[PDB]
C-alpha cells in the first residue's frame, strides 16, 4: 500500500533524472507534491510541468532539465526549529553552497533559506540538489 | 483479489471523465427513480438494479442522471437492505460453505476458505459498527 | 420467583424485565428479597429517566414538524398571492 504520495513522487523524479529522461509522469498527484515541484521549479532544478485532471488524484508530467542531481523525501516529517537548519544542512545536503531543504511551515511550503529568512520553523518534507 | 490471497487482478470498470448523460437519453430523473425503486421492490440488490438499467434502459450511471446513488435512492424510500449488500453476500458465502463442510469434513480447502471469509466478515462488521450502518453488539455467529 | 411473579402480575415490571430478573435470580445475583426489590427500583428509575428523555425528544420532533408544515403553507399562500 502506498503510504506517502510525496515520497513516491520524489522517488520517481530521482529515477528519471538518473536515467537522463526528458519527461517523467507522476501519479498520484497532491497539493504537497505540486507545492514541492513549484519550489524546485522556482530555483530552476526542473522545467515546466503540467497537471492533468482525471476527476481523481491527478497526474503530473514534469519536464526535466538535467540540473537535478537528486531529490528525495524525508520520512517521518521531523520537526525543525530555526536553530536546527544548520544540522539538517550538514546531514543531508552535499554542501553549504547549494542544495535546498524543503520545509512545511505555517507560512507555507518553502526552502530552508527562505524559512530561515522568515524566522519560521516547521517539518522537513524533503531535499533537492 | 488482494485481501486474503495472492491475486493481483486489475479487472474493474473505468468511469468516464464526462459525467453528463448523453443527449439521446430521454428518460427523466423521476422515471429512473421509479425504476430503481420498483426494481428493488422486485427484490434486486443495488448492484443488480444498476446492471439491469445499464443493459436494458441505456442508463450508464444512475447517479449521473438522478444525482443520487442507487443505495441512496433506496434509503430515501426506506428500501435499503437491513444488512449491507456486500456483508449480506459474504455471510451467504460463509453459510453455504458451512453447509458444505457439514457433509464434507475432510474438505480442508473449504475449511481454509471459510477462515478467510469469516476473518473478512469480522473486519467488515467492525467497519459497519464503527460507521453505524450496523447496530452495536452486532456479532457474526458461526 | 414468587416475588417476581407477583410483580409481573401486578404490572410493576414487564415480561422482558421479568425474564432478565428470573435468569439473574437463577444465577445467584440477589441475596434476598430486599436485594431484588432494590434492583427492581433501580431499573424502574433508570427506565423513568430514559423515558422522560424520549418524551422530550418526541415533543421537540413534533414541534419541528409543525414549524415545517406551517412554513410550507405560508409559502403556498405567498405563491398564490404573488400570482397577480
Amino acid at each position: 500500500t502506498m503510504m506517502s504520495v510525496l515520497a513516491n513522487a520524489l522517488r520517481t523524479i530521482a529515477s528519471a533524472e538518473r536515467r537522463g529522461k526528458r519527461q517523467v509522469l507522476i501519479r498520484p498527484s497532491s497539493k504537497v507534491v505540486v507545492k514541492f515541484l513549484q519550489v524546485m521549479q522556482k530555483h530552476g532544478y526542473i522545467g515546466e510541468f503540467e497537471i492533468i485532471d482525471d476527476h481523481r488524484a491527478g497526474k503530473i508530467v514534469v519536464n526535466l532539465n538535467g540540473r537535478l542531481n537528486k531529490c528525495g523525501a524525508i520520512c517521518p516529517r521531523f520537526d525543525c526549529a530555526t536553530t536546527d537548519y544548520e544540522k539538517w544542512m550538514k546531514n543531508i545536503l552535499p554542501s553549504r553552497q547549494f542544495g535546498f531543504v524543503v520545509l512545511t511551515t505555517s507560512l507555507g511550503i518553502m526552502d530552508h533559506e527562505e524559512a530561515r529568512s522568515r524566522n519560521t520553523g516547521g517539518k522537513v518534507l524533503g531535499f533537492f540538489y | 483479489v488482494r485481501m486474503h490471497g495472492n491475486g493481483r487482478g486489475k479487472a474493474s470498470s473505468a468511469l468516464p471523465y464526462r459525467r453528463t448523460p448523453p443527449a439521446w437519453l430521454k428518460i427523466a430523473s423521476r422515471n429512473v427513480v421509479k425504476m430503481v425503486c420498483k426494481s428493488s421492490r422486485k427484490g434486486m440488490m443495488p448492484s443488480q438494479i444498476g446492471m439491469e438499467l445499464r443493459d436494458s434502459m441505456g442508463i450508464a450511471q444512475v447517479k449521473n442522471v438522478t444525482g443520487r446513488k442507487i443505495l441512496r435512492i433506496l434509503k430515501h424510500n426506506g428500501l435499503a437492505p437491513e444488512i449491507p449488500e456486500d456483508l449480506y453476500f459474504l455471510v451467504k458465502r460463509a453459510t453455504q460453505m458451512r453447509k458444505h463442510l457439514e457433509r464434507h469434513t475432510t474438505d480442508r480447502d473449504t475449511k481454509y476458505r471459510l477462515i478467510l471469509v469469516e476473518s473478512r466478515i469480522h473486519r467488515l462488521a467492525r467497519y459497519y459498527k464503527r460507521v453505524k450502518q450496523l447496530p452495536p453488539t452486532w456479532k457474526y455467529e458461526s | 420467583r414468587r416475588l417476581l411473579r407477583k410483580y409481573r402480575a401486578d404490572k410493576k415490571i414487564d415480561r422482558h424485565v421479568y425474564r432478565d430478573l428470573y435468569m439473574r435470580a437463577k444465577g445467584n445475583v440477589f441475596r434476598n428479597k430486599r436485594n431484588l426489590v432494590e434492583h427492581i427500583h433501580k431499573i424502574k428509575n433508570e427506565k423513568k429517566k430514559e423515558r422522560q428523555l424520549a418524551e422530550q425528544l418526541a415533543a421537540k420532533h413534533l414541534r419541528d414538524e409543525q414549524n415545517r408544515n406551517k412554513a410550507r403553507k405560508q409559502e403556498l399562500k405567498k405563491r398564490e398571492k404573488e400570482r397577480e
Binding site: - | 420498483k38 422486485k42 427484490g43 | -
Partner: protein, 92 residues
C-alpha cells in the same frame, strides 16, 4: 437459490404465515398465493397440505432443505415445516 431470494423478499415486504395449521387456515380461505413445504415434512401432513393446495389451485413448492433450513431461510430462529405467503409483496 432462487427460492431463498424469493423467500427473503417476501419476508422483507410481503405477508406470510408459518406453521402447518396457519397454512391450512390460509388455504381454506382464498388468501394463500404460494406454499413452501420442507423435505422434512411428515408424509401424511405433506399429503394433506398438497391436497388442500390442489383443491385451492395454489402453487406448491418443495423446498430442498428441511424444516430447520426453511426456518433459517425465513430469517427465523425456529423450524417451520410449511410456509404460506399471503401477499407476495411484489416478489412474484
Amino acid at each position: 437459490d432462487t427460492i431463498n431470494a424469493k423467500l427473503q423478499l417476501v419476508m422483507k415486504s410481503g405477508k406470510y404465515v408459518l406453521g402447518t395449521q396457519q397454512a391450512l387456515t390460509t388455504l381454506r380461505q382464498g388468501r394463500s398465493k404460494l406454499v413452501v413445504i420442507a423435505n422434512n415434512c411428515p408424509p401424511i401432513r405433506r399429503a394433506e397440505v398438497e391436497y388442500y393446495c390442489t383443491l385451492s389451485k395454489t402453487p406448491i413448492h418443495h423446498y430442498s432443505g428441511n424444516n430447520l433450513d426453511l426456518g433459517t431461510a425465513c430469517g427465523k430462529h425456529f423450524r417451520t415445516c410449511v410456509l404460506s405467503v399471503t401477499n407476495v409483496g411484489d416478489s412474484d
